[PDB]
Design a protein around this ligand. Structure first.
Ligand SMILES: C[C@@H]1COCCN1c1cc([C@]2(O)C[C@H]3CC[C@@H](C2)O3)c2cnn(-c3cc[nH]n3)c2n1
Lengths: 1349, 139, 138
């Protein structure tokens, strides 16, 4: 309202992005009507500030944190009970757009799920409070019925009688709720109804005449059980709720679990059997097969399966904590035995069957996985059921996971299932038609045939196709109409759309709803238009509500959130059509960049965009639809299947565009025939850019630059095109578009490719070449950041290598050194210029590499490196100092001098940096002193105040400059996207998020157990949060920190822009900061413990534990035969170590939905990290270093010291690629490796083979990082760097580079006999997995790796 | 374009491929369909045929190409249902496309559909139709 | 009866996915002609022989299989069908390639390897002529 300015002023007295956070806090408010206004205002804000949010959305690969928190709380709004807000947020999410779930970051916002707080017993206070809540929640609703109100009032008496407090439990009562019991505090009340025996009626209750009603069944069975229980206090508590039960079913819901618990406590054997028979009656009763009254029996079966599931989960948990109490007498033992026998009475397979019937797919999978592994059922018999499960859960990794397990040949129906899950449409329609020929009476087959025909874009043959079966089967005409409708509006034949819509309105399918919206848009019907719009927007929210439960919720519901952005674009593209003045504020060009880079997300958006551009008929709205066809072609050629891409190309060629030819070339290039593609391109370039007419104008110059670049790229594969021809092509590209990263970058790449062969690997003649190289690499960096990981590290490597070679030749006193000296002069001059143009954050990437060369021998090269490092420090001092301080405290004197030099230059360049550095050094100094202090005897805890008084003191000074806690979320850069912010970069923010500062430490200091004892310290952040951190006393972090940077780089590739994101592949990166070469501080991953401790704990619970002397019996000398080693392994270590890890899963994650969506993440995480470890040569993966997130199931790898097959140099060679034993296999599930794991190892390897160039480039610098002690340090008598080099070079650096490149390439080089070595593709994954689970290889591992474990 | 029509009629596909490679201009849709027919590829030919049907609905050549490709793919029952849909859309074109229908029927061994599509169809010289006649009369 | 399996394996090895081809042919040769009881049929014998030979070739294609196992599979192909040109011929060819690596390009050590090669190639030319232009020259 207008007159809020004074109120805004007084609120600011108490106090865009600001407005957004206030709106968020308004959404989080409990009041519905508050939320309504808040969300309306927020939607208007988004529509108004679109062009700013779009900047906030696509500024960088990761959106600003405000947008992430916003989308999280909006997804929380979809769980809101009010329909109005959930629609208003169908609108709230569509306004912002279905951003790429990679561009989001839910880690800080998906921090919910405390769960916990078991309700074990009614006598316990937990159930007391829960039953009070049951006594009130609709006691507010029983005020209309006297006996209902009196009943809960009487139950208040019996509850408050035992639970009166005059007082901590009385305070636990809410003030209003305890006020509700105030009229019945202790005033005695009569019974509200009479007592009727439920045992008199025939059993089972669920079947006959009492079960047929849900609440009636619950009350009747509950009263029967009350007559069956023996705990007298429990009997009273259940009788007082008995009257309560005949009034509402939710009291049965809350108490029936504990009711069955107390039954199992005291009951006869035949009583238990009657109860179990009632359970089986609930389970085997499918509502569809029984013939009786409906609408109460169907919902009865549904809700009854649901409530028996909840109570059985409570029981399952009841038995778990019961075993815990037995670990914590005979009567408790007897209750444990009774509940265990009760649970085992029910067949787990029956549980899974019932859950699948009730659409509880996660419950079904959990119960079935427990079923097969426990009851030892052969898997191949239950296979088809498992495929049905994974197909229902839309988890393709299961289905394609099942096939590899299937021994028998796949049935036709299962062939259809496979073709449906994994999308291979060309082969799918053939399978559908074969099924039809086998079985034409069915309908799902014809549903499929038309479906694939839709995907391939044969739209015209679709509508004609459906009419065929329509004439043959008119009854199939209406459910088949939805496909017919889809093609119609996709064909934009609204007349036929009208015929098909008036033909049937009884279809709700998404395509039909789109068709209705579009028809109403054409024949302008504003009111019915918006009516149907709200209708469909609500329709999409319904499934998005259940999927919004925060377990990677956004990605699972992204398909729907696409539809919400779909509808938002639809709406904002129609309101102009209705008002006519008013134009859409949408930036369609940028609204697509945000969309996930996969066909199953982009294509439906572009389909509707084309439909709307058919509705809106502007003079340019005939090439715009052509451009949209072209864009769908681009995304399809990106997403594999080329047929749809080519069909779109056809539907686009009518538009006159030179981009058409670039896209046709790229598509032909995706097929592989570079020759045909280059031919078509050269033909197109001549057509659209005749050389007699310069195209220096408008979009034409851009398209022509792109086309010329594509020709220059093509020319490099076909070995016919001479070098200088490619040279001229790239030079012409540069001359065309001199403000463009791709041109200069690819030209420099070709330069570096030509260099070593033209100059015969003779560095002296390479000066001018390197000059051109670093000239174009830098200018490339000046206009974009798409390839910075390829360009910048390569540039720096080349320049510093040439400098080192010049220094060396100067000492060789050779003839070439002088011209090479002034050449190096030119090169460092160009580097200086780049330093003057580039932004600092660009150099912030690969900053560890810059530091790795500060001991550079050449002095002036070091001066330029000085000028570089200073610029980064001056702009980002905190993030710089952390990676720096390890060098500051290094043992090498020359390294120390160079670090002092760079710090002195920095403080000379800025003054407050002096205070910052002076504080941080002392801070790192006292932290070092901490890491080095010997443990006080054996006490596991230490008081920092008592021991490290100066440490606590230093942070306590106010003048102590706030130091940023080195978290991996604040040591990793965040580049800007190709578009937007890099049009105005050097102002881009490379660390978006709330920097937390060291405000203090917790006086407690844990000390873990290791050969060298790590010391955990907690850091009280300036925000108030506490982040744990551990000193590693004797390890060289330089290597582990450099590897963690590389893993973060991988996460950059993985998290965004892949199918990998769906599987939520994510390498667990935690900060690793060296404080000294000897001492490092490692960010603690909270909620985790080592694998071996986990399993040992599990084995103890089973009592089985093979002894240490038995271990000594197992170990044999290496000279002993391999076969007998294997026989010892098999016959002793295997049976004394059955696979238990699934028990750990069921324990840590009892909630079935969470259990699955966790274990699924375990397979994915261990697969991804194992794969990264293979192509990294990660070694020494003994069962202690793997350790798992006890909240999500991912695994965190630690102690990366053994790198690049450095386990082969171990006394016991490390044969296996990655730690994958039979126990870890069991945790994956009964499917084993062949399930999600292999499919997760496949996509990771594909992403590796794709991003080879950035990863290989960065790793090349890592392998050349001289700071890490590749070999152990020569003692102080003779420094390994001699104190003159300050560096150590790796002799096996080139061997490591070659081997790693080979592993990425996919050539194994395993057999010294087989030499042809055709590179493998995904059979690489199969070979690796066969290389892990192999018993022969596992056995040769020294028991330190614990292969048995 | 005329040279392409000629080489196509002379059933010399290499000539059509040459006329393709010579074209400095963009091939029109009809020339594209001719090129796909000569090159023999099926899926992309179906794509072009559907593009044409969307462009010219009142055509029997494009529908014939679409159904012939569908028959080539081996989507026999789909071919039959598609021919039936075209029949419902136009009863006058069914006589032209009935040969694909009876070819699929004989292939699918639906002798009932064979005799049915043979009774409705007039005298046709298509090898598929005569083969269906011989096969049915052999049943 | 393994004919569909072998043909699907050939279709895959043609498409380029040699890994899927090898795994499918292995699953086939497992399901049909299981290793518990040999294929007594003379027709099933020829089919299991073609399967063993195709698996040997597919193994030769990829590099993850050890040379000894490939030699063994080819020997099994020679055994289960001792009257097929293919088989003897392909095994001679495999031992032919393996010879330069085994003998380390030392003709002195090549002796018995050359003997085995020539024996297998002659046996191959005996029962057929489909490689009489590739066998007899070598
Ligand atoms: C989850 C925790 C805290 O979270 C961060 C990762 N991490 C650990 C944990 C461990 C250990 O549990 C392994 C064994 C058992 C007891 C003791 C500590 O030695 C190590 C070892 N090396 N590293 C290194 C080295 C470089 N980076 N990390 C460790 N990091």
């Amino acid at each position: 309202h207008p007159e809020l300015k004074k109120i805004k002023a007084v609120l600011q007295e108490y106090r865009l992005q600001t407005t957004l956070q206030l709106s968020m806090k308004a959404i989080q408010h409990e009041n519905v009507d508050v939320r309504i206004h808040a969300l309306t205002s927020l939607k208007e804000t988004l529509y108004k500030n679109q062009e700013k949010l779009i900047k906030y959305a696509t500024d960088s690969e990761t959106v600003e944190p405000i947008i992430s928190q916003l989308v999280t709380v909006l997804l929380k709004g979809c769980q809101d009970a009010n329909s109005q807000a959930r629609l208003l947020c169908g609108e709230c999410l569509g306004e912002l757009g279905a951003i790429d779930p990679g561009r989001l970051d839910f880690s800080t916002t998906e921090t919910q799920g405390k769960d916990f707080t078991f309700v074990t017993g009614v006598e316990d206070s937990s159930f007391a409070y829960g039953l009070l809540m049951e006594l009130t929640r609709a006691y507010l609703a029983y005020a209309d019925n006297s006996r209902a109100q009196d009943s809960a009032a009487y139950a208040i008496q019996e509850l408050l009688s035992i639970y009166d407090c005059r007082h901590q439990l009385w305070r636990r009562f809410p003030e209003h709720v305890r006020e509700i019991l105030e009229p019945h505090l202790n005033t005695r009340y009569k019974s509200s109804q009479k007592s009727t025996d439920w045992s008199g009626v025939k059993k089972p209750i669920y079947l006959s005449k009492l079960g047929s009603n849900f609440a009636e069944w619950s009350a009747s069975w509950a009263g029967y059980l009350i007559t069956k229980v023996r705990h007298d206090l429990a009997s009273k508590i259940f009788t007082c709720c008995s009257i309560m039960m005949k009034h509402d079913f939710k009291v049965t819901i809350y108490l029936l679990p504990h009711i069955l618990v107390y039954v199992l406590l005291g009951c006869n054997q035949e009583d238990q059997q009657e109860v179990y028979a009632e359970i089986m009656a609930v389970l085997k009763h499918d509502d569809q097969h029984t013939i009786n009254t409906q609408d109460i029996a169907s919902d009865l079966c549904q809700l009854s399966t649901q409530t028996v599931f909840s109570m059985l989960d409570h029981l399952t948990q009841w038995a778990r904590h019961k075993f815990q109490a037995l670990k914590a007498s005979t009567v408790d033992y007897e209750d444990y035995q009774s509940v265990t026998r009760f649970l085992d009475l029910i067949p787990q397979d029956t549980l899974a069957v019932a859950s699948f019937r009730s659409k509880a797919y996660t419950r079904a999978v959990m119960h079935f996985e427990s079923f097969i592994t426990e009851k030892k059922q052969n898997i191949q018999e239950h296979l088809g059921f498992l495929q049905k499960l994974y197909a229902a859960m839309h988890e393709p990794d299961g289905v394609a996971g099942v096939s590899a397990i299937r021994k028998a040949e796949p049935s036709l129906k299962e062939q259809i299932l496979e073709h449906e899950s994994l999308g291979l449409l060309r082969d799918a329609t053939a399978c559908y038609d074969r099924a039809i020929q086998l079985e034409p009476d069915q309908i799902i087959h014809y549903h499929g045939v038309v479906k694939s025909m839709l995907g391939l874009g044969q739209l015209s043959t679709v509508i004609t196709q459906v009419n065929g079966v329509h004439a043959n089967r008119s009854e199939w005409t209406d459910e088949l109409n939805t496909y017919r409708v889809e093609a119609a509006w996709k064909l934009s034949q609204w007349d036929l759309v009208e015929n098909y819509l008036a033909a049937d309105g009884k279809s709700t399918t998404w395509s039909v709803r789109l068709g209705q919206l579009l028809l109403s848009a054409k024949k302008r019907d504003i009111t019915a238009f918006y009516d149907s719009l709200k209708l469909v927007r609500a329709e999409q929210i319904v499934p998005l509500s259940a999927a919004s439960f925060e377990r990677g919720s956004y990605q699972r519901g992204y398909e729907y959130i696409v539809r919400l952005h779909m509808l938002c674009e639809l709406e904002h593209s129609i309101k102009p059509l209705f008002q006519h003045s008013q134009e859409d504020s949408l930036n369609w060009v940028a609204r697509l960049e945000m969309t996930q880079n996969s066909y199953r997300a982009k294509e439906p958006i572009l389909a509707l965009r084309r439909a709307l551009l058919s509705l809106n008929k502007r003079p340019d709205y005939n090439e715009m639809v052509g451009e949209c066809w072209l864009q769908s072609a681009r995304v399809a050629r990106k997403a594999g299947h080329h047929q749809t891409a080519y069909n779109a190309l056809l539907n686009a060629g009518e538009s006159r565009l030179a981009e058409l030819y670039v896209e046709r070339a790229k598509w032909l290039w995706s097929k592989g025939d570079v020759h045909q593609a280059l031919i078509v391109l050269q033909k197109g370039v001549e057509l659209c850019f005749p050389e007699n007419e310069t195209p220096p104008e408008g979009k034409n110059m851009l398209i022509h630059g792109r086309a010329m670049l594509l020709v220059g790229r093509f020319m490099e594969e076909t070995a016919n095109f001479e070098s200088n021809a490619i040279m001229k092509k790239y030079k012409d590209v540069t001359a065309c578009l001199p403000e463009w990263e791709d041109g200069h970058f690819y030209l420099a790449k070709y330069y570096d490719k030509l260099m070593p062969m033209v100059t015969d690997n003779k560095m002296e003649k390479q000066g001018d070449l390197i000059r051109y190289i670093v000239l174009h690499f830098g200018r490339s960096l000046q206009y974009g950041n798409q390839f910075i990981y390829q360009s910048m590290p390569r540039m720096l490597t080349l320049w510093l290598d040439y400098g080192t070679k010049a220094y060396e030749w100067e000492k060789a006193g050779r003839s070439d050194r002088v011209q090479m000296r002034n050449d190096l002069g030119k090169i460092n001059k160009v580097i200086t210029e780049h330093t003057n143009y580039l932004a600092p954050y660009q150099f912030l990437t690969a900053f560890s590499q810059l530091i790795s060369r500060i001991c550079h021998s050449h002095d002036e090269v070091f001066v330029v490196l000085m000028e570089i490092i200073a610029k980064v420090f001056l702009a980002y001092p905190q993030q710089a100092m952390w990676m720096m301080t390890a060098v500051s405290k290094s043992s090498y004197p020359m390294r120390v001098n160079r670090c002092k030099e760079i710090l002195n230059k920095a403080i000379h360049m800025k003054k407050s940096l002096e205070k910052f550095v002076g504080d941080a050094t002392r801070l790192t100094d006292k932290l070092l002193e901490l890491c080095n202090k010997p443990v006080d005897g054996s006490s596991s805890t230490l008081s920092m105040s008592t021991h490290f008084k100066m440490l606590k003191k230093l942070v306590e000074e106010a003048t102590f400059s706030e130091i940023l806690i080195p978290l991996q979320s604040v040591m990793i850069p965040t580049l800007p996207s190709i578009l937007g912010t890099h049009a105005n970069h050097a102002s881009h923010e490379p660390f978006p998020g709330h920097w937390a500062y060291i405000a203090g430490f917790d006086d407690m200091v844990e000390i873990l157990a290791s050969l060298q004892k790590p010391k955990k310290i907690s850091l009280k952040g300036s925000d108030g949060k506490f982040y744990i951190m551990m000193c590693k006393p004797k390890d060289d972090l330089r290597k582990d920190c450099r590897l963690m940077e590389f893993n973060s780089l991988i996460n950059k590739c993985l998290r965004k822009d892949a199918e990998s994101r769906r599987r939520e592949l994510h390498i667990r990166t935690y900060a690793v900061i060296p404080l000294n070469d000897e001492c490092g501080i490692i960010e603690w991953v909270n909620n985790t413990a080592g694998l071996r401790p986990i399993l040992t704990k599990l084995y103890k619970e089973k009592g089985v534990y093979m002894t240490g002397k038995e271990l000594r019996q197992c170990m044999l000398p290496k000279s002993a035969a391999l076969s007998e080693k294997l026989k010892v392994f098999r016959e002793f270590l295997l049976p004394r170590h059955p696979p238990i890890f699934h028990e750990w899963f069921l324990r840590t994650f009892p909630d079935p939905t969470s259990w699955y969506s966790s274990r699924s993440a375990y397979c994915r995480s261990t697969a991804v990290m194992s794969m990264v470890g293979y192509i990294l040569g990660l070694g020494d993966r003994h069962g202690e270093n793997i350790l798992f997130d006890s909240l999500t199931g991912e695994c965190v790898h630690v102690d990366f010291n053994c790198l690049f097959n450095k386990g082969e140099t171990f006394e016991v060679p490390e044969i296996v690629p990655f730690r994958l034993t039979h126990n870890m296999v069991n945790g994956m599930g009964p499917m084993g490796t062949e399930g999600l794991f292999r499919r997760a190892c496949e996509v990771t390897m594909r992403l590796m083979r794709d991003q080879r160039e950035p990863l290989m480039s960065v790793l090349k610098t890592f392998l050349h990082d001289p700071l890490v002690e590749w070999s152990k340090p020569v003692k102080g008598h003779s420094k390994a760097p001699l104190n003159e080099t300050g560096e150590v070079v790796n002799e096996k650096a080139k061997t490591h580079v070659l081997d790693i490149e080979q592993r990425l390439q996919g050539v194994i080089k395993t057999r010294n006999r087989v030499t042809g070595l055709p590179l493998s593709i995904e059979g690489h994954v199969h070979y690796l997995i066969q290389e892990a689970t192999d018993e022969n290889l596992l056995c040769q591992m020294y028991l330190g790796w614990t292969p048995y474990m």
